[PDB]
From Swiss-Prot, chains A, C:
Organism of provenance: Escherichia coli (strain K12)
Keywords (A to Z) from UniProt: Cytoplasm, DNA-binding, FAD, Flavoprotein, Oxidoreductase, Stress response
Record protein name field: Putative acyl-CoA dehydrogenase AidB
Entry GO MF terms: 3-methylbutanoyl-CoA dehydrogenase activity; acyl-CoA dehydrogenase activity; DNA binding; identical protein binding; sequence-specific DNA binding
Domain of life: Bacteria
Keyword Cytoplasm applies: yes
CDD domains associated with the record: AidB (cd01154)
Cofactor(s) demanded: FAD
Swiss-Prot record, chain B:
Binding site for FAD: 182-191, 216-218, 423-433
PANTHER family in the cross-refs: ACYL-COA DEHYDROGENASE, ACYL-COA DEHYDROGENASE AIDB-RELATED
InterPro entries: Acyl-CoA_dehydrogenase-like, Acyl-CoA_DH_CS, Acyl-CoA_Oxase/DH_mid-dom, AcylCo_DH-like_C, AcylCo_DH/oxidase_C, AcylCoA_DH/oxidase_NM_dom_sf, AidB, AidB_N
Molecular function terms from GO: 3-methylbutanoyl-CoA dehydrogenase activity; acyl-CoA dehydrogenase activity; DNA binding; identical protein binding; sequence-specific DNA binding
Subcellular location: Cytoplasm
Cellular component, GO annotation: cytoplasm
Record's function text: Part of the adaptive DNA-repair response to alkylating agents. Could prevent alkylation damage by protecting DNA and destroying alkylating agents that have yet to reach their DNA target. Binds to double-stranded DNA with a preference for a DNA region that includes its own promoter. Shows weak isovaleryl-CoA dehydrogenase activity in vitro.
Main location: cytoplasm
Region (dsDNA-binding): 445-540
Protein name from the UniProt record: Putative acyl-CoA dehydrogenase AidB
Signal peptide extent: none
Record PROSITE patterns: ACYL_COA_DH_1, ACYL_COA_DH_2
Lineage: Bacteria, Pseudomonadati, Pseudomonadota, Gammaproteobacteria, Enterobacterales
Length: 539, 540, 539
């Protein structure tokens, strides 16, 4: 008699699922792209990462963001950052699963980049902030392994380990390392040539750095690769957190960013007060170096946005299956079932493209593969990271009101999305790069012709899309970089669907994405298969 | 460098990584003297563990990340749960591992257990105080439950005697360890519990339906609370479990979480009972009689807890004062400071002596004379010591100065905790009214005092004069002098202990400083040195 | 049937009362000490300040503490502090009521200091943090008015206004000002001789300051009087927030204290990076100057603590009067009544001593009056500020559990008390100063004897106390500085009680405070009278 009502028609939130085994498109991609040997392991962590206890860690790390500790209680400079225990727990698992170095092990087998991409994608569905140090370390490791200055040769062993080490010590004394990246300044992020951080050559071949970095993520990194001006031009420096003699480097943490999302991750405004750096490569070869690593971090952005889209979608279909409206399961409602099917179709294409791209990276020794990666990485980052926002927003709306409340995973996802689109130059820069590749790089047109010819006749909308692109690649105006990049990206997904997806699935994908007319209805059967694949049972 | 504007110097390193036990001379001597010497090795062991920086950090985390009340889930269903920072649970594990909640109630507990347990308690208290609340309540309630558990809960006996903290959201019977809370206070009264309006109706099966509220309901996550409610037969005490036997959640509704000055790591709720099921303990109307048994022990914990926090505050102060220089010399060498610090050390010596003598009384409660001693000095010790805590800790804070007023320091948290112990369980006045009630109603109280006072007569002139004043001060029966009488009675208790077991110079010092009404007592250079030295260890 | 219980015996909290007219001892003191002309105004603001709306401003200012803005969104240094709107409202009223300068107006009448003290004591009961800038400004004003450097002569008018101006502008362009004091450094606050902030003389006569201040309250002050080392000794500098040319002075705000209490008030850790200062007086004359101001701020500490004890006590008795326990009003319960009466008696004494002490300051032109002030100011600060903690804690306990909750005014008061005892050298330094006056000052022993002889024979306990002080002054050790200062303070209050208080009241006070035998019962008539005077009706 105390109650005013009974609570019903409230679906149970998705948890204790298998992030891997419930993703049909992913299972197929992993095996298809030569990482089948990691399938058992993927399912293993898929189950671990998908538990309530795991998702809670994600929540804790974000709602208890890091504190910047500039001083101690005595008034001495401290320059440290303090995290919630959940942060460290996430790091342990990321490093245990070698998301930061799997591909760089000395005996790493074929498909390692692809396998590692799958491992990454699972973690990304749980928590995103923690991916930042992992992404940076992953991209920087190959570079360091062959360019480490003499005083830090003993970093090789920890760089190749599977142990997270949060000890406040010099890198050489630690079990595992994290590498950060300091490029962006107040005057520019895309245009790094405008940096005003200067480096004066010190004695032993080291340099004195004086300047600042505007966005300096993971200040607790064991080292940052930093860009600074020298007499010889813009160079890249290895700036360790501790000097060889055990003293703390002269990096001053001034301010912690107060971010829309990505809140679990510490992003600082730092200043260099005669900090010591070691020159990597040659003076003026700075931009050339960070361009090598950029390729890989961009891929992580695209993959990360995709992972979050996948999670948001999983939450949405799980909810829509249980929630009833107007007498029927929400997911049975014609208009909803239509929207959800198009969303699933979106993820199928992205899964296909992203893991094809991963294969390219795994086989970068092949000039044709390296060129494929060089081209589609920026494209995938631009398109997928742009889609993230509208896509996650839609998922949120499938849940309705409760999806707009912070107790749900959706707001945090929705809040994270834009960071991936802004990171590393932003969309426009991606598109200018795509244009630059088509123009400057040799044998690009030949590479495209081969793939397009390989699937000609399989689908009318694809072939028409190919014709439209070649017509736009005659007079490629800069102001059409987005149109060109988008169309180029779709053709990439299209080819993959046509080659390896079932004919009905590819027919569906091509129609929905490449049919300019619109009004595209999907067969009852193809919709059922999409939604079924998106919940597993295809593994 | 050229970037700096100054050099940081004369800033002392904060006290950490010390041994909370081995650095307390008075405590080591007390433990051995009061028959708990067998626990000395263990005490030093946890004394080291608890005194580490990592441990102190747990204390800080538990307080600056206070519990959240979860009334509802994301679906709009009632949840009635409380979510803590991991540090809270870590503190609880250690407290239970160290059996601070049940050591004395083990079936084979040896002699001195209450005294040993008091020492274990005192160490923990210096680290974090909030976590002590569930421990204090469970410790006081356990003896009662062990022999009064209703039939459906006989399988609580094993967990009640364990050393395993269990935070699982399950019925008690399925758990490895338990916590018992206490629901007495209502909006209309805390001291006067007969004004309770929570009512209980007897049901067909022997349990009762409770409808009402509790104003301060600490540790709502307890596995059960002993609750007072009105019945047709009068004010009774009920065992109100969090889960019913059939695994369903009892009808206890958590409405509001208190936003407290201190004690913040501990969840204190405003709850309402919506036909919650309770099991009658004892007889209808025997309610106040039951919670009076348990009150004796929780009061002791309040006194000990305040003492522990005073000890910690003092440790921080002397450690600071030893390093900090002012006007060319170590702060602790400055005549006026060294004088204040010595009086503070002297304060703790007396409290240590009295509190652990009291702990012995509880350990030997089978002896009528000991039980009476406890019945008399427990309330007195709670009144005086818990009152002193505030000015005492404030003084410690001032020894550090500006930095002691900042929350990065342990001092503000200690300063903020202190009043809770004085307010808890009736408050100072109630303690004093109780002391007066014992002198009046209880038989052979005057005889008991006479024996102790005679045993030390002639040893100190200020003590004997203090004894004369008390016996006279009792000349006219008067409620409005309850505090004067309770305070004087307390000092005489400490005095006797110092005179019997402390060194003659130490006891001479204590008696002069505490009992010399003519004030202005200077202390010998030697006695001050010995006080401060004892307060840092080396006497163990 | 929805309810589980009925709420009763829950007293209404004290609000919408008159902070002045409810304080019998205060009304009498104001009239007695030559400030009876302000009575109509004191009752006026006493009404305004006691309102719920007023008290709410206090709460807001403290639960929404200031934020330090070291940088703006563009990464340019900003060094500003942002307050809750309630803070500025509190400031507006304080300045409107001239709590910061009443006594320094050019045509200030007799008893201005005593009237200002009364106004201060009322504001102090609503909010304490806001008193910091007021106290500092009040103490520095007289000094500045006759020492202002040439470039800041036009500061005279604003210094004497009733205007609060929070505009971020150079002083000269504002309608009112606030002055701060920067003395304490990390190495010491009591021993300022250990300061390492150094000032070099410049071409133009001003100085370059490089150093730091550990506690630096009201960083938003229009100027700070700062102590720094020069070639000729430790000196006092006028450091304006803006330079004459409008540029911001080189005062760098590094960090904001996270305080036990006093949270509404901004206290900073600051550093000087070649900040411009102007010498006040002669080099090495620094300590001599800040000693002149120290006199008045120490008085404000004592007054503030007294004020907060008064407020606490008002709350306690209003509560005890409504709250029932064991069938009677809590205030009727013999033990409670006894305690509350002693507390009231405590405030009677303090009120008498403080406003006699205020008279001394007002008539400081008389050497005998200045000497009385010189002696009892340090004493009153030591004793009263020390009593504050146990006193307010008692008040809190009268309310019980609800008094321990932050929704009550008690915790905020309780959290405030220690700051007044720590400010300006702390208790020990006060007692050392009192000893220095009894030793180094001439005619002190005479001044005291004149007062004691004037009341000899009126009370046995008072005379016995006098004989014990004179005996304790035979051998005046340093270690007895507290015992001596305490005894002195008591005799001070005692003299005032015996002279101007009703004989029964003076007897009660003497018996309670000076009867070493303890165990004093008070008559039912004197208790009824004490509590009646503490709720007004004597005005
Ligand atoms: C959460 C977070 C963390 C970060 N962490 C780091 C870090 O760890 N290390 C680091 O170095 N940086 C970091 N950054 C900075 C980030 O890399 C840059 O912000 C990003 O590269 C864009 O630089 P910017 O902000 O200066 O944008 P701007 O350079 O001002 O660019 C503005 C816009 O102009 C567009 N644009 C640029 N050139 C052209 C052109 N020729 N034609 C048309 N449009 C153009 C860009 O697409 C962009 O959208 C972080 C940023 C965020 C939000
Ligand atoms: C952090 C915290 C946690 C708490 N947790 C719990 C809990 O878990 N369970 C629980 O039951 N209670 C709890 N309490 C309540 C606490 O036990 C009561 O607040 C306390 O007993 C005082 O009662 P009260 O607040 O009703 O004050 P009142 O009973 O209104 O008394 C107020 C004052 O009156 C004095 N007084 C009472 N009677 C007399 C008399 N005859 N003569 C003179 N003076 C008298 C009291 O000593 C006290 O100073 C908690 C309180 C706090 C602050
Ligand atoms: C909220 C707040 C605001 C503040 N604002 C300001 C401000 O605006 N400007 C400013 O300059 N300071 C400020 N302070 C600091 C305050 O003035 C100092 O902290 C105070 O003077 C004591 O200095 P300290 O902390 O260095 O104590 P210390 O100098 O380390 O003193 C330590 C203790 O030893 C005692 N002592 C010192 N010398 C002796 C001796 N010879 N014999 C016996 N005992 C002795 C002292 O009384 C003190 O209790 C502020 C502090 C607080 C908490
Ligand atoms: Cl900081
Ligand atoms: Cl809730
Ligand atoms: Cl800032």
């Amino acid at each position: 008699h105390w109650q005013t009502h009974t609570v019903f028609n409230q679906p149970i939130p998705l948890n204790n699922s298998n992030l891997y085994l419930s993703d049909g498109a992913l299972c197929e991609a992993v095996t298809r792209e030569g990482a089948g040997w990691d399938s058992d392991f993927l399912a293993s962590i898929g189950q671990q990462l998908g538990t309530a206890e795991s998702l809670e860690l994600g929540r804790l790390a974000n709602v208890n963001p890091p504190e910047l500790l500039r001083y101690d209680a005595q008034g001495r400079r401290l320059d440290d950052v303090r995290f919630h225990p959940a942060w460290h727990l996430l790091m342990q698992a990321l490093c245990t699963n070698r998301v930061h170095n799997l591909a760089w092990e000395e005996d790493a087998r074929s498909g390692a980049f692809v396998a590692r991409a799958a491992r990454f994608m699972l973690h990304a569905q749980v928590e995103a902030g923690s991916l930042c140090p992992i992404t940076m370390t992953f991209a920087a490791t190959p570079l360091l392994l062959q360019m480490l200055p003499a005083p830090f040769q003993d970093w090789t062993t920890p760089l190749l380990s599977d142990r997270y080490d949060s000890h406040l010590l010099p890198g050489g004394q630690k079990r595992g390392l994290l590498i950060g990246m300091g490029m962006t300044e107040k005057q520019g992020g895309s245009d790094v040539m405008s940096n005003t951080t200067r480096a004066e050559r010190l004695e032993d071949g080291s340099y004195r750095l004086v300047g600042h970095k505007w966005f300096f993520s993971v200040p607790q990194s064991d080292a940052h690769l930093v860009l600074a001006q020298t007499a010889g031009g813009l160079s890249c420096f290895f700036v360790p957190r501790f000097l060889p003699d055990g003293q703390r480097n002269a990096i001053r943490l001034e301010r912690l960013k107060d971010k829309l999302g990505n809140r679990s991750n510490a992003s600082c405004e730092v200043e260099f007060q005669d900090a010591i750096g070691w020159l990597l490569g040659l003076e003026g070869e700075g931009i050339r170096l960070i361009l090598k690593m950029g390729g890989m971090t961009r891929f992580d952005c695209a993959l990360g946005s995709h992972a979050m889209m996948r999670r948001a979608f999983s939450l949405a279909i799980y909810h829509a299956h249980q929630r009833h409206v107007f007498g029927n399961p929400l997911i049975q409602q014609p208009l909803m079932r239509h929207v959800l099917s198009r969303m699933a179709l979106q993820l199928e294409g992205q899964t296909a493209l992203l893991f094809r791209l991963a294969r390219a990276w795994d086989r970068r020794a092949d000039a044709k593969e390296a060129l494929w990666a060089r081209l589609f990485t920026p494209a995938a980052k631009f398109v997928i990271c742009k889609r993230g926002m509208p896509f996650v927003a839609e998922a949120m709306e499938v849940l309705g009101g409760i999806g707009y409340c912070e107790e749900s995973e959706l707001p945090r996802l929705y809040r994270e999305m834009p960071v991936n689109s802004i990171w590393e130059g932003s969309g426009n820069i991606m598109c200018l790069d795509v244009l630059r590749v088509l123009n400057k790089q040799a044998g690009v047109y030949d590479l495209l012709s081969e793939a397009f010819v390989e699937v000609k006749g399989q689908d009318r909308y694809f072939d028409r899309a190919v014709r439209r692109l070649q017509q736009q690649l005659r007079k490629p105006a800069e102001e059409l970089g987005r149109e060109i990049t988008h169309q180029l990206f779709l053709l990439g997904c299209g080819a993959q669907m046509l080659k390896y997806a079932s004919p009905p699935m590819a027919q569906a994908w091509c129609q929905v994405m490449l049919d300019t007319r619109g009004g595209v209805r999907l067969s009852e059967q193809i919709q059922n298969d999409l939604l079924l694949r998106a919940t597993g049972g295809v593994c």
